[PDB]
Amino acid sequence: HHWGYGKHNGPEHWHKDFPIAKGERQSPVDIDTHTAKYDPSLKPLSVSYDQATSLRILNNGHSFQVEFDDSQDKAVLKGGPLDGTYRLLQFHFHWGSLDGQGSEHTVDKKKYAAELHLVHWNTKYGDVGKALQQPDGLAVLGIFLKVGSAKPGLQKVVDVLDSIKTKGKSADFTNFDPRGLLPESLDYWTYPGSLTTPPLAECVTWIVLKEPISVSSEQVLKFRKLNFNGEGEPEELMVDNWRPAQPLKNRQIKASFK
Numbered sequence: 001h002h003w004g005y006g007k008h009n010g011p012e013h014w015h016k017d018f019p020i021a022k023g024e025r026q027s028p029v030d031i032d033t034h035t036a037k038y039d040p041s042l043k044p045l046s047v048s049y050d051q052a053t054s055l056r057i058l059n060n061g062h063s064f065q066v067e068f069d070d071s072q073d074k075a076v077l078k079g080g081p082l083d084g085t086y087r088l089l090q091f092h093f094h095w096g097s098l099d100g101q102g103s104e105h106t107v108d109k110k111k112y113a114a115e116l117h118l119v120h121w122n123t124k125y126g127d128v129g130k131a132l133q134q135p136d137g138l139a140v141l142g143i144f145l146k147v148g149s150a151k152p153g154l155q156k157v158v159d160v161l162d163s164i165k166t167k168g169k170s171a172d173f174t175n176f177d178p179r180g181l182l183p184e185s186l187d188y189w190t191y192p193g194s195l196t197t198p199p200l201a202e203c204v205t206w207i208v209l210k211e212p213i214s215v216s217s218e219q220v221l222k223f224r225k226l227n228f229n230g231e232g233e234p235e236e237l238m239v240d241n242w243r244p245a246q247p248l249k250n251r252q253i254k255a256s257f258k
């Protein structure tokens with residue numbers, strides 16, 4: 001609607017329209033690495049992206065999102081903390097105005113320049129809209145971005161952003177391989193949480209990778225040239241589209257490693 005990221009419509013306002021914003025399993029959170037307990041019962045994640053079919057990229061006025069065909073079992077996530085199979089629906093990012101900010105999760109209070117979310121839904125619920133109504137409906141793979149060397153697998157995304165500068169713009173984006181956005185290691189933390197944007201539904205198993213990816217200053221600059229506004233309204237750069245850390249409450253963050 002009118003929710004967004006500014007002073008008058010940002011995260012501190014969302015609770016008026018979405019009261020679960022003050023719920024018991026909200027995301028993101030700070031990852032206290034000394035308190036997260038290694039769980040030797042967790043499994044390696046299985047990330048099977050070999051058959052992914054990207055379709056389109058879209059400026060939705062909050063972020064940009066790369067969508068996939070999830071009408072069968074092509075790109076799927078399973079294992080780790082998950083039971084059953086989760087299909088990849090879309091990925092999007094959160095980023096800052098300055099490199100010292102932009103991530104939603106934090107690690108010992110450290111903020112990363114950006115955070116990538118690969119959003120998957122549990123096939124036992126048949127469609128994403130049903131899955132949003134279930135505590136185990138979605139699995140989101142979160143990957144930190146730091147600024148350093150370019151990520152070559154990101155360049156195709158960055159090069160299309162000028163064709164989707166404003167809200168409501170989209171572009172075919174076929175043949176994109178999300179495998180090129182992953183770091184080497186799949187070591188992760190996991191905890192039960194929520195969407196980080198309205199409706200803030202408490203339906204997500206979070207899987208946050210420990211190893212960040214590096215992206216170049218030029219790449220992240222291109223994110224920051226996007227607009228929150230649509231073609232013809234005052235220009236508002238799309239930056240600082242992150243929700244800060246929420247109370248952990250009665251949750252445990254588990255580590256897959258160490």
Ligand SMILES: NS(=O)(=O)c1c(F)c(F)c(SCCO)c(F)c1NC1CCCCCCC1
Pocket residue numbers: 060062063065092117119128140194195196197198199
């Ligand atoms: N971080 S996240 O996964 O919760 C998320 C955002 F933070 C976003 F800012 C966005 S962009 C605008 C939301 O409509 C997003 F699509 C998602 N993805 C989902 C939320 C919207 C509901 C539709 C389908 C689930 C994906």
Ligand SMILES: [Zn+2]
Pocket residue numbers: 092093094117196
């Ligand atoms: Zn997100």
